[PDB]
């Protein structure tokens, strides 16, 4: 019974932690990319994040 709970918690945790990866962009924070960069260039980073 504990294995199911542990597996689900671990999968959910890694899903959460995958939000902290750049994926080749300039940052992992989308608001930071928007605030620091103009709309024409922001799409390039946003596409990698997507």
């Amino acid at each position: 019974l504990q294995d199911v709970v542990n597996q689900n918690a671990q999968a959910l945790n890694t899903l959460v932690k995958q939000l902290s990866s750049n994926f080749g962009a300039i940052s992992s924070v989308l608001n930071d990319i928007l605030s620091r960069l103009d709309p024409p260039e922001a799409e390039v980073q946003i596409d990698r994040l997507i």
Binding site: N31, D32, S35, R36
Partner: protein, 50 residues
């Protein structure tokens, strides 16, 4: 007498670290009063969020 190619140019370059440390140089902005117990969008020294 030298042309613009060899005319001296004066260059100043700025290097900006934007990692969320105790930031000390900010842009000109007005610090309003804070509110509590309401979902608001905030900006604490560049730490934007909702």
């Amino acid at each position: 007498t030298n042309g613009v190619g060899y005319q001296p140019y004066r260059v100043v370059v700025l290097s900006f670290e934007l990692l969320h440390a105790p930031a000390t140089v900010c842009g000109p902005k007005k610090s309003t009063n804070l509110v509590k117990n309401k979902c608001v969008n905030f900006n604490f020294n560049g730490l934007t969020g909702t």
